[PDB]
RNA sequence: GAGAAGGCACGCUGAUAUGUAGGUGAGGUCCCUCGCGGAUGGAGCUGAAAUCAGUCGAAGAUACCAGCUGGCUGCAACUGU
RNA sequence: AAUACGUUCCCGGGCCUUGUACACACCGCCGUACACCAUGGGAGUGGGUUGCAAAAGAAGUAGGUAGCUUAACCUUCGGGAGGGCGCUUACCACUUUGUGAUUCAUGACUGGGGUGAAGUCGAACAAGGUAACCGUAGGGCCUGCGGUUGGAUCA
RNA sequence: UUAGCUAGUAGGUGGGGUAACGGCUCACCUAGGCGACGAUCCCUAGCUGGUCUGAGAGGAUGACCAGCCACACUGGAACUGAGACACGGUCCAGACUCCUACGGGAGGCAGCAGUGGGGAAUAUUGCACAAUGGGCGCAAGCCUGAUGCAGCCAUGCCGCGUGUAUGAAGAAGGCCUUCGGGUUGUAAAGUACUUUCAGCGGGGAGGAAGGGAGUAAAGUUAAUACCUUUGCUCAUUGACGUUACCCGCAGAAGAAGCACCGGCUAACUCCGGCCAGCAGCCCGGUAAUACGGAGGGUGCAAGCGUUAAUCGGAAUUACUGGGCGUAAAGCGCACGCAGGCGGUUUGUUAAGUCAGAUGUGAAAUCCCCGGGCUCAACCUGGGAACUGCAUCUGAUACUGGCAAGCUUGAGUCUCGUAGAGGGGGGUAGAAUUCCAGGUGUAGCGGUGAAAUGCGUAGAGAUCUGGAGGAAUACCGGUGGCGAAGGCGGCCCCCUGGACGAAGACUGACGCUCAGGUGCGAAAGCGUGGGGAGCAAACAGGAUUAGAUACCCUGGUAGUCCACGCCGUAAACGAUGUCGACUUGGAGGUUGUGCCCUUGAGGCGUGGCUUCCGGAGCUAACGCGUUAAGUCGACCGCCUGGGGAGUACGGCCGCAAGGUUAAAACUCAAAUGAAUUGACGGGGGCCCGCACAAGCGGUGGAGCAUGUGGUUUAAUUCGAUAA
């Protein structure tokens, strides 16, 4: 662009939109199982991916992925989630696991941090 | 229309160069002929002459050294669409100091370096390596 | 559409101004190719509206007189017959 | 034994060239039932904020003052000046009314959009079997008019 | 997707008012003021030094620390005072909470702790005025949730520890194994040594200056009192605190976890079925280095990961530092105001520019050299820096202003040239259709083939006359004119532009252009005509599985004219306008000059135009003096694919719709050019019992045999060019 074309306009810096805006720039939001159930995942992959819809505090419904295997969650259960997609469209974030009501998934040895699982005691 | 006579020369002289022409002519002019001076003083061309009395036309002597172009870039910093005023401080150096950088100062039209030791600044004209 | 809706002011007395702006226009003076003339001239007469101050009553468009208003919709365009 | 004139057509193959949105490579992509998500319209409905025309007038400040009251000061001892309260006017907050503007949520119903190994019916890519596309108009894409080559073949 | 706003509004005179100028306020007068350099309106927001990031320019940001501002339950107001319209003052009103004898009262943690609530989340209802500072006081001193400290939290930065040395045939168990062994692994056990930190006990700075009481000297004074200052003496002043630090004791004793190992990215094996699951972007359908577990290893380490957020990488908003022929992007074209830029010479100014000096740019922070904490973090001395702004003095090259010029850019005049340039009127011939008539007879028309259709009421064919509308064969041509859209018989009338020759003239009068205006194919709309041919819609006949299509027979709007509207096209060279420079070749078209013009000749010189091609440029294709090469001025436009040139709002329109123009959501692609194949209901060439020419069969019958299916206890398994 002229440098006349630019005086008179200036570069507009392009605006990026978040990939989570039902967080608010928190890192993590409680919300309510609004409906726990499962979903099938998109083209190549086939699963019976487990998810959970939940009302969060801010008033926002969004549904969340329920990761490790097995869980425990049902109506009007108040989790927590963060950031996090599932490549599953439309799910953009992740039920934290060991958050006051999503318990850890039992019988975790390796990155149980990730899951909210205590240590193994000797 | 013509509204930049100066980049109108350095072009002459760039394309003069690039035709491998012998000589290049143009409307003369003040300026044209400090600049002239200031390029032949520092080595890129040969001679310049001034000819006609109601019309002038400069005639630069273009220069070659191996069958190559002496001028390898010249280009016009200071536009009528963007004027470039340097303090001395900063002065630019053309290729770490190998070329030179046509400074207009309140002395005369002279090289960067000129201008660096005379303490002045000025309007960059131009950058030839 | 629309006087949409809605609102404010409204009497009397005084002052501005011993009656104002405006209207009307005598005498006078001047001119005139002269008359039911022209110009100037302002006496007298008439006279709103407004502002300010005061003042009375429960109430000042005080009586008679003198639109109810808005929204949605059917039908017919309309005034008319 | 018969027949083969010949390469026009069916099939398969070889060479060259051309177009291609094909490349598990022609046995190779478009638009009108179900689920979810976001969104436009929608008789209205409930909020926020705000404009205009008003009404209102607490306390306070200031102007006016005949009613009540009043230590310093003046006085002829009678009072006077001044002050205070009360009243009142001006400004003004809350508040009230009417009518608009804008924003959010919401709403029977309705329009499209996106996403979803697996549903139904049948334009583009080769000259895609009516060349395609652009503007426009008419009719579960076609046709008319004009334009473009970003069309193939041309003894 | 907010363009107009403003009545005390702008200014003036006078009165008042304030500590002070002032529409600060009032009376009157004038009619102004702000605004495209964004007024007004709407949304968001405390500002700065600074912090994070970055090579830098920038981008993000404003917690702690320091400066400024505003607020003190909400709204309003004043009083006192030097200072307030006042956090812990006053009055009023409102909401709320509490006491009440029901008549009245009281309160404001956004001070320090703390409570409930909200949230993913942020601490003690602590000690002392010992130090610094503050208020009051002559002072002593009193007050001080400022402050000095302490408590809690791995929240961050920094430092230290969780031992050290030796230790093998390398034990056990674990894992793997070609069953040989390998690895965990000197790792462990064992042995020798040590004791930082934590635990127990004993010493112990510094933060402490002062203040008090005494005396002595000096000053003051009439005074050897009192007071002030100055020396010295004495007894004291610490919340932290059991301080820092030091010393002794005992014993490895009290102290390692988290993530990862497919690629990006350091780190590999075993075991359990597109399920369970992983995933920052590109695994799992029965030997998964990708899931889960184990062994091993890798990286960090009192931390480790995930999430959220900023910058970087992202040259991915490109000022430094990008593009627009085909990948996203040149307005359809032009005129033109504001704006941007502007040929050449002289003089002058010194506004931009440059140089020097002065003032300022708070401290902290950043950076450099040192110093003190045992090191570091941290604290701190000095410097540099703060890239900025203002003023003053000079410089005059360039830009700007002013004045005078100049002719080369730009225009005017003279004479001619070519042209489907435009508007109006007239006319000509060929042809289609229709009407009337003559001849003539059974078909015509149409198609791949048909049929619908016309025809014995005489069609088609042919001949004659007439009517009407539309378009102009041959010329005719990668020819001409026009800004573009476009313009095609001939003639006349009006009219624009371009070019050339030689001169004369004006003297920068120029280029570009947001908004604005005008022109703008076809279709479409309105009014009034016209209507031969063609032909959306429509009807019928075909084709087809269907055929709302292609094909056929008709046929309305429309196409045509006048006047308005519409304002869009693959409006294309997918290439904005203007100017300068850069090797060539062959043509076309239109002027002009020269020569016994030899010739329809040759040689120059302009304008426009087509094809090829050199350097150069390009991702390539290709462009290439008519650039997509080298530059300059200005404008328009682009920022991944969809959603979407869509919705809403505005403007425009009779309508159809045009124009300006998002968002949520969704994917990791979408795209351009070229390459090797494959394919084509593309082309060329050529073969094969491939077709054609023939002969004999199979499919029909009975039986043999193999298969499928069915049946069965089994009808074993496999083969589907089977």
Do not use: W
């Not at chain 1, 662009?1 to 039902?22: D, E, G, W």
């Not at chain 2, 022409?21 to 002929?33: C, E, G, R, Y």
């Amino acid at each position: 662009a002229t440098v006349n074309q630019l005086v008179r306009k200036p570069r507009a810096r392009k605006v990026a939109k978040s990939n989570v805006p039902a967080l608010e720039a928190c890192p993590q939001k409680r919300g309510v199982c609004t409906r726990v159930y499962t979903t099938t995942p998109k083209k190549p992959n086939s699963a019976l991916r487990k998810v959970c819809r939940v009302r969060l505090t801010n008033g926002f419904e969004v549904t969340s992925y329920i990761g490790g295997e097995g869980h425990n969650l049902q109506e009007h259960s108040v989790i927590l989630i963060r950031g996090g997609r599932v490549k599953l469209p439309g799910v953009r974030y992740h039920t934290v696991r060991g958050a006051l009501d999503c318990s850890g998934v039992k019988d975790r040895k390796q990155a149980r941090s990730k899951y909210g699982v205590k240590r193994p005691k000797a | 229309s013509m509204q930049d006579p100066i980049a109108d020369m350095l072009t002459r002289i760039r394309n003069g160069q690039a035709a491998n022409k012998a000589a290049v002519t143009m409307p003369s002019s003040k300026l044209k002929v400090a600049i002239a001076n200031v390029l032949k003083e520092e080595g890129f061309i040969e001679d310049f002459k001034v000819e006609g009395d109601t019309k002038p036309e400069l005639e630069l002597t273009l220069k070659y050294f191996q069958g190559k172009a002496v001028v390898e870039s010249i280009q016009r910093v200071s536009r009528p669409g963007l004027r470039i005023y340097k303090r001395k401080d900063e002065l630019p150096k053309v290729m770490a100091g190998l070329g030179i950088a046509v400074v207009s100062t309140s002395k005369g039209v002279m090289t960067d370096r000129a201008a660096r030791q005379a303490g002045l600044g000025g309007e960059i004209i131009c950058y030839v390596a």
